[PDB]
Design a protein around this nucleic acid. Structure first.
Ligand SMILES: [Ca+2]
Ligand code: NA
Length: 276
DNA sequence: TCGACGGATCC
DNA sequence: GCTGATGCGC
DNA sequence: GGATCCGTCGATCGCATCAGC
């Protein structure tokens, strides 16, 4: 069936108002996305922090439209070392961060422009574009090394500040997070190993799955539909884009959204509301 | 994702 | 700047 | 021996590279 994301809850479980709006979006071609009216949608959503994944754009080519962006003044980018046109992430934020790191501290997993870390006063925000297992699972064993090292790094991080992980994690955690689960159990993003990986990330750091925590039996809620076969029109998609929260910040959670109606990519954007 | 391909197995 | 062909994607 | 029932197996749209001139 189709999905209607419920209205935005901007008060916390204790009725404190939301102070902080993090929107995250796998833009699948920053340049294509900007041309497809993507930045207009960002201006009207008006986040405090915008996280972008799969920018597929070097720093040189970064379109002009982004310098204009004024509520998202501080702007951080990471693209791979030697593979041009591939992967890439960004982190734009209204307020200026205390510190910005690139990578997870592992030479092996830091060559593809996938993670930005941003320390704010109350918490630390990691935004990640996780590597796909590949068509035919050619990268699936790399993905298991990634998942284990990314888990270790994130456990280390969250032991020092509360942690918001956002972005495209390239796995549908459970059979509710995708429309055709039994047909994809051998495909990238729903192998037992990717799903086992996610659950270990949830129990190890630990982190609660922001959206599922609030809506644990809502189905047909997805972040990505393939461009092929009119899949988005039939809403035949996957939940790939999460906010993963330290349990500590669960009482700061106001709401976690899926912006199904925002076009511009093969992922819709998700949005987090915190009282901080 | 969706279909055409088989090659199976059931009335 | 163009064509045409590859890489990479859930 | 017709008709359904199964898991493999293509090409599916999109973005951005690249080789070459
Ligand atoms: Ca490839
Ligand atoms: Na006969």
């Amino acid at each position: 069936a189709l999905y209607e994301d419920p209205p935005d809850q901007k008060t916390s479980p204790s009725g404190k108002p939301a102070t902080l709006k993090i929107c995250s979006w796998n833009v699948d071609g920053l340049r294509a996305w900007i041309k497809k009216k993507g930045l207009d949608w960002v201006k009207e959503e008006a986040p405090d922090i915008l996280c972008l994944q799969e920018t597929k754009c070097s720093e040189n080519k970064l379109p002009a439209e982004l310098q204009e962006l004024p509520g998202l003044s501080h702007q951080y980018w990471s693209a791979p070392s030697d593979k041009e046109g591939y992967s890439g992430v960004g982190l734009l934020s209204r307020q200026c961060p205390l510190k910005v790191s690139y990578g997870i501290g592992d030479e092996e997993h830091d060559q593809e422009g996938r993670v930005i870390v941003a320390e704010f006063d109350s918490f630390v925000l990691v935004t990640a574009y996780v590597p796909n297992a590949g068509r035919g699972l050619v990268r699936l064993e790399y993905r298991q090394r990634w998942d284990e090292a990314f888990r270790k790094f994130l456990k280390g991080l969250a032991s020092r500040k509360p942690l918001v992980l956002c972005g495209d994690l390239n796995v549908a955690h459970e059979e509710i997070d995708l429309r055709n689960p039994k047909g994809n159990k051998k495909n990238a993003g729903f192998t037992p190993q990717e799903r086992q990986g996610f659950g270990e990330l949830l129990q190890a750091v630990p982190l609660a799955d922001s959206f599922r925590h609030l809506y644990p039996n809502t189905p047909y809620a997805y972040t990505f539909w393939t461009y092929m076969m009119n899949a988005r029109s039939k809403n035949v998609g996957w939940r790939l884009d999460y906010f993963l929260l330290s349990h500590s910040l669960l009482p700061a959670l106001c709401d976690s959204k899926i912006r199904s109606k925002a076009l511009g990519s093969d992922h819709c954007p998700i949005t987090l509301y915190l009282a901080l």
